[PDB]
Design a protein around this ligand. Sequence first.
Ligand SMILES: CCCCCCCCCCCCC/C=C/[C@H](O)[C@H](N)CO
Ligand SMILES: CCCCCCCCCCCCC/C=C/[C@H](O)[C@H](N)CO
Lengths: 64, 251, 251, 57, 57, 276, 276, 178
Amino acid sequence: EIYCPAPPQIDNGIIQGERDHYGYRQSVTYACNKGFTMIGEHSIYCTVNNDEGEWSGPPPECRG
Amino acid sequence: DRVRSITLGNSTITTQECANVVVGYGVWPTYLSDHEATAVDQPTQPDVATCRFYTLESVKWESSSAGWWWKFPEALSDMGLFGQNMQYHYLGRTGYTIHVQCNASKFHQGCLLVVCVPEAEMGAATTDHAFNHTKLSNIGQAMEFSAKKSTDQTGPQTAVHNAGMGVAVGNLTIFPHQWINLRTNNSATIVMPYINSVPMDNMYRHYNFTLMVIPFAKLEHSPQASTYVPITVTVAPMCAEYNGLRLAGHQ
Amino acid sequence: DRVRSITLGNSTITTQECANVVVGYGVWPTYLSDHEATAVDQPTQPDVATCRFYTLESVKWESSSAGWWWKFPEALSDMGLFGQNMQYHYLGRTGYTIHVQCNASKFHQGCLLVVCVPEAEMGAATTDHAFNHTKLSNIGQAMEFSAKKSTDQTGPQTAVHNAGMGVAVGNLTIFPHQWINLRTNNSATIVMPYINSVPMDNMYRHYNFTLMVIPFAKLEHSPQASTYVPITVTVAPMCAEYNGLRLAGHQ
Amino acid sequence: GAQVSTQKTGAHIIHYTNINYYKDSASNSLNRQDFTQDPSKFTEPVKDVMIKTLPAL
Amino acid sequence: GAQVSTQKTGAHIIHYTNINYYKDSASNSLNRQDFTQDPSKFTEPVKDVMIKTLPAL
Amino acid sequence: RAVGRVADTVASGPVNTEQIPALTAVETGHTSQVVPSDTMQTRHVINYHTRSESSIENFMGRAACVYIAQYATEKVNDELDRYTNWEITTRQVAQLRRKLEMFTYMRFDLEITFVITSSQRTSTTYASDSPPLTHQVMYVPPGGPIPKSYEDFAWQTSTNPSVFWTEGNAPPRMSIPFMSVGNAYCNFYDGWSHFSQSGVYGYTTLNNMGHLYFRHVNKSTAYPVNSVARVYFKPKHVKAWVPRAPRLCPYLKARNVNFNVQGVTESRNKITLDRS
Amino acid sequence: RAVGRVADTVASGPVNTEQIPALTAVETGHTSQVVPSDTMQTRHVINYHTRSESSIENFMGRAACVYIAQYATEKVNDELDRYTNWEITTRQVAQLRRKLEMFTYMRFDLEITFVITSSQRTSTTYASDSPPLTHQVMYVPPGGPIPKSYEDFAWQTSTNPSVFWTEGNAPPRMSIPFMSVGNAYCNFYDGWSHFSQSGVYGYTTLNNMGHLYFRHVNKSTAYPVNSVARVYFKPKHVKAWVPRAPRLCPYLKARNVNFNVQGVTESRNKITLDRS
Amino acid sequence: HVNSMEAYRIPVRPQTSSGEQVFGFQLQPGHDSVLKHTLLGEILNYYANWSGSMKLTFMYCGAAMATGKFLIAYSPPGAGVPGSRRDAMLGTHVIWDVGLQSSCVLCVPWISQTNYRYVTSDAYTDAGYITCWYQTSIVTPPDIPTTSTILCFVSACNDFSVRLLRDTPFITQQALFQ
Ligand SMILES: CCCCCCCCCCCCC/C=C/[C@H](O)[C@H](N)CO
Ligand SMILES: CCCCCCCCCCCCC/C=C/[C@H](O)[C@H](N)CO
C-alpha cells in the first residue's frame, strides 16, 4: 500500500481527527480557529496519479 | 405532469422535476422465453428479494469536475442478494433501471449528460501494457475521468473529451440517455433492457454496459451559495434470473 | 418396490433398500395461503436456488456410540443460498425432507431410531446455570449425546436414555420417524412440513424442530469386518419463502 | 332461541336444554359432546399406502 | 318477547337470549355490539375532495 | 365483510407511473390515506381483525371507582361524623377523569355500585357480639333538604331514592338515566358563571347533579366501627362528541383544570442511533 | 354406529393362505393395524364402549389449582405483605403442568375460580367482633401500572377487570378468551429471546400474560388475619396439536425444563418368570 | 429540549458529505420516548396489543428556494441498527424529493411473525427501527439561513387494531382530589 504524507499543516487552523497514516480517498479536515473567517473550503483528500502520492489541492487560509 | 413514482421491490422513488423515462432502445425488460434460451437447467427467479433500488455512494460535483463512470453489474456486486446470487451462479440475465439524481437550486447552473453505453471497451493509458481489473471498475466507488490525458502505466485512458472508448464524447447520444439540466431537470432515469449477443452470460468476466455521467456545462454558482452539490445514483435490477447453481465464486 | 428416487432442485437421491416415506403428520409441505398469512409484504420464493439436497458431514458409528442430534434450520445455516436468505430476512417458513443414510453389510448388525422432534427444548446439565448457544447446536457439526449423565457447567443434559428433553427415550415414536435396521433397511426418509404456531418466524432465535438419531441396538460385527461405518444426513428444504428484507444479520 | 340436544345415556326425557345467556363465546359451557377422532395421522403417516395383508417390503 | 342474536366468536350454539325485565331503558344491559365507524370526519375534513393519487396542490 | 372488520391489503406490482400516492400536502390539513400497497409490493393477506375493544361502549363500559366515603358509628370530628356526604362529581379520581376528558360532550346512562366495607376501630378491647350493620344511601337532588345530623327526619326518604344494605350480601346496584338539562354532559365549559364575566370559571358551574348521603341505620355499637363506602360508576349506552387531545400533565384540583407545566415527552441523549 | 364408538370384532375362520396380517415392518415407521380376528379365531361381539372420557374437552376440562397466594392484614415482611402478586403462569404446580406438556401447541378458553380462606393469626388473645372481610382481585395486563403498596390509587380498577368477594358466599368465577398473540399457546419454545442467540432460553420469553393482584378491601382488623387465595384454572373449548411424549422425571424450576436423570422404569430382578 | 417547541423540530442543514443520518428512533409506538406521548401514543397506551401498519408523514418547513432529497428507512429487527446509508438502503425505504408537494408518506408496513405486538415492549415482539439519511444534500441559493426544520407526523392506516384494555401508566395520583 502507498501512504499519503502527514502533511505539514496548517496556518491559523486546527486538526480534527488525526490518524498517522493517510491512504486512498481519505480526507483531512481543517477548521480555522475562533477569530478567523474562511477563504474557501475545508477538506482536501489524497489522490493517485503515479505510484507515489499525492495530495489533491492547495491548503486553505483564513483572514480574521 | 412533471411527477413520476417508481416502485420496485420493497422500495420506492419519487421525483418532482422529472423529464421523462427513456426505456432503452424501446424495450421493457422481460424474462427469457422458451425459444431464445440455451441452458437446459431450471432458473431461479427472485422477484422481490433482488429487484429493488440499491443506492450507491454519492459523488461530489466539483467546479473543476470531469466526469464519472460506473460499470454494471460489477458496480452492484456488494449490494444485497444481488451480490450473493452473482456468486452462487454461473450465468445471469437482467435489465436495469438507473436513476441519477442531483438537486442544487434555482441559483446554480450546470448540465450533465447521463448515458448508458453498452460494452464500453476502454483503451489503455500506456499502450503495450495490460491494465488492472480494478482501475476499470472497483466494487462500489465509481471511477473518475481526468481533465487532461492520462499518463498512467496500468490504467485506462481517462481523457473525458475522448470518452475513454476513443470516440468523440458528443457522439454518445445514440446510447439511451438523458440530461440533468439544473435550470429545468432534476433527475434522469433510463430503463435499460438486457443487451447482449448471448441469452445469459457470466456476471464477473463481463460488464454488460457502462453508465457514464459527464458535466458538459460546468457547475458555477455564487461564492456565497452552497459549495457542495452531490450526485447520487440509485440503480435497480429488473426481471433478473440466474442459472447453473454451483459453489461460491469468483476465482 | 424397494426403490425410490427423490429429485429436488438440481440434485437427486436414489435408494435401493428404502422402507417408505413418512410425510410428517400426514401433510405435504405447502406455501402460505392468503388467509393464514400475517405479514403484508411480498415474499421472495426461490424455487430451485434453495430447495435442494444439502448434505451435511458424515458422523462415525462407533461400537460404544450413544446418539447424535441436529437442530434445524440452524444446522443448515452455512449451506448455499439457504444461509444467505436466512441472513437478509427477518421471517422464514419452510418444510424439509430429511434423508439419513447408512449402509454397512449383510454381516453387520444394529438398529437406529431416526426421529424429527418438534421443539425439543433441552434441559441444563448443571441447573441454575444458563447454558451456551453453541453447546446446543453448532453450525455444521451435529452434537453428541453422552452414554451416562452429564456434569457440564454450561451444557445441555446429554444422557441418551432420557432423550435430552426429560422424557423416556422409547416414547419418541409419536414424532414422525423411521428406523435404519441394517438387517433390512438402509436409509430413512422423513418429509416434515412446517410445524409452528405462527405462520412465519425468525430463523436464528428459534429452532423449529430437532433431528435425533439414536442407536438402539448397537453396532456389532466381526473383528475382521469393516471397522468404520459412516452416517450421512442429506436434508433438503421444501416450499421455502422469506419475508421482510433488511440488511444482513444476525446480531 | 333454545337448543335441545341428546343426553349421555347408556346403551342396551333423554334431552336437555341450553340457553346461552352471555353475549360472548368464551362464556359458554364446556363442549363435552365432540367424539370425532382421526388417528391415521399418527398410525399411518406414510406416503405409499401399506395394505395390512400384503407384505410391507 | 324474546330476542336472539349472535355471540362474539373468533373467525377461522352461537346464539344468546336477552329478555328485558325492567320497564325503562336505562335499566338495559350494555350495548357491546355496535361496531359502526366513520373516520372521514377527522381524516378528510376538506371541502374539495382530494384523490390520493393526484397531487394535492 | 362484517362490521368493525379492518380492511385487508390488495396485491400490487412494480409500478412506474405518473401517480404519486406518497407525495401530499399537510398544509391542507388532510391526513394521508396511503395503503401499504401503494409504496411497495405487498401480497394479498386477509385481515380478520375486529375493532371490538375500541368502541365507546367497550371502552368506557368498565366500572371505575370515584369516591372513598368514610363514616363511623361514634362521632369524633366532622370528617368522621355519624353520617357523611359527597357532592356528585366524577373529577375526584385520576383514572376515570382522564377517560371522560378525552371527549368534549358525552351522553351516557350510568349504573352505580357501592362496595361498603366496615372495619373495627382500635380501642382497649374488641370482644363484642355485633348484629350485621345496615347502611342507607340517600340521593338528594339539587335543591333538596339535606340532613343536618343523624336522628333527623330528613332521612325518611319520602320521595328521594334510597337503598338499604345488610352486610354480607351482594353489592347494591341501581341504574341512572341521562340526568342533564342540556343535551350532553359538558366535560369542558370554557366560560364564566355570571353574565358580567365573573364568578367561577370552568365546568364547576355546570356540574349540578346533587349529593349522596351515607349513614348507618343501626343506632349503636358497643365498640365503634369505621365504615368505608366506595362508589363505582360505569357508563353505558354512551355517545361521545368532539374528541379532545388527551391530558399530559397530572391533575391538581377537583374543580379546576389547573396544572403545572412539564415537557412534552421523555428525553433521550442523542437524536440519531449508532450501531453497525 | 354412533360417534366415538369403538369398533367390534368380526367373525373369522381357520385360514391357510398367502395373506400375512401378522408380518410387517417397523422400519417403515408404521404401526400395525392387526385386528384380533386376523391372528386367531374370534366370534362376533358387539362393542358398545364409547371413547367419551378420552377427548381433550373431557380430559382437560377439570379444574386444577395453580397457585397458593398468601397475604395478610398487618405486614410482617414482603412475603406476607398487605397485598401480594402472582405472575400468571401454569407451570408452578406439578399436576396441571404435566397435562399441558402432553401437547406442544394448545388453544383453550379458560375459566378461573378463587377459593379464598381466611384464618386467624396466632396471638396472645383472639376475642373480637369482625365484619366479613372483602377481597379484591385485580388483573393487570402486561405493561400496566402495578400497585406499589396498599392505600394506593392504582387499585381504582379504572379499566382493569376486578372482582370483589364478601366472605361466606359462592366462589367467584370469570371466563377468559384465548389471550395469546400468536395462534396457539406454545407450551414449548425451543429457542432464545434475543436475536444473537442469547438472553433466556425456553418458554419464559413467550409467557407474557400479566399479573394478578390480591388484597383485602377492609382496612383494619383488631387482631390480624392471614388469608390464603387459591386459583383454579380450567380449560374449555380446547384444541391441541403435536402431542409430546409424557414427561418422566419430576420438575425442578417453574421457568426451565431442568431435570435430574433417572432410569426409564422400575427394575425387577430377572427378565424371565418361573412357576409351573 | 422537551421544555420548549424545539422538541418537534428536526433540523437539517447543507452537508459536507452525503449519507449522514438525519434522525433515528426505534419503532415502539407505545413505549419509545419519541412515540409514546403523541396522539398515537396516549390511545395505544390504554391497551396491551396492537396490529396493523402505520404511516410517517413528513413536511419540509424550509425556504421555498431550497432543495433536498432524503431516504427514510424502516428496517425489521433482525440485524440490529443500520449503520450507514448503504446498510439502510437494503430494507424498506422511500426516496423523498422536496418540490412543490412538500410532504412524503413513508408507510411503515406490518411484517411480523405474531398477529399482534405488545404495547409495552417485550423482546419476542420487537418491531424495528426508523431512520432517515441524507440522500444527496441541501442545496440553497445565497441569502438564505442554514438551519431548517422538518416536521414528522405519525398516523395509523386502515388496518390498525388494538386489544386487551388496561389502565394508562401516565396519570397517577396519591390521594383523592378535593
Ligand atoms: C340511590 C342512590 C342513587 C344515586 C343517583 C346518582 C346519579 C347522579 C349521577 C350523575 C351522572 C353524571 C355524572 C357527572 C358527569 C359530568 O358530566 C362530567 N364528569 C363533568 O364533570
Ligand atoms: C379478574 C381476574 C381475571 C384474571 C384474568 C387472567 C387471564 C390470563 C390467563 C392466561 C391463560 C393462559 C395461561 C398460560 C398458559 C401457557 O400457554 C402455557 N402454560 C405455557 O406455560
